[PDB]
Design a protein around this ligand. Sequence first.
Ligand code: A1BSZ
Ligand code: ZN
Length: 139
Amino acid sequence: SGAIYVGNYRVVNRHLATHNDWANLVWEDSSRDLLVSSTTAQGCDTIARCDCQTGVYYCSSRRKHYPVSFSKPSLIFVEASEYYPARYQSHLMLAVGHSEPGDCGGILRCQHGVVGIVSTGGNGLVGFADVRDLLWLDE
Ligand SMILES: COc1ncc(Br)cc1CC(=O)N1CCC[C@H](C(N)=O)C1
Ligand SMILES: [Zn+2]
């Protein structure tokens, strides 16, 4: 679990969105596993605007942060789950690292700010849904 709080927005994995998230829907994309809902309280997370390929992610299944090198956002094939059939997920970045299903929502950050959130994993690889292209999160 986990979210990014920026301005009047809440960014979560789409497969984990709540009833309140859908009732206050701003934007959602199944192909990216992202959902953004509006909030009354103001968020303070800084979104990174960069092309960094190194950062640190929070892994709740180990109560630890891990440094990783990650790929550039791209279309990656993701196995079927209870939330989606087998498909290509877009804007996905992979790193060699540990994750379990409950790790989705952990933040990946670089020196410039928040890069994305854990979205997929398996076989010793962790995938993060990039959010750096969503320029509107700041305005
Ligand atoms: C961090 O997730 C995981 N990590 C390790 C294993 Br094994 C398994 C996972 C779960 C995972 O990859 N999923 C399930 C939930 C929806 C996901 C999606 N974006 O399509 C795919
Ligand atoms: Zn950066």
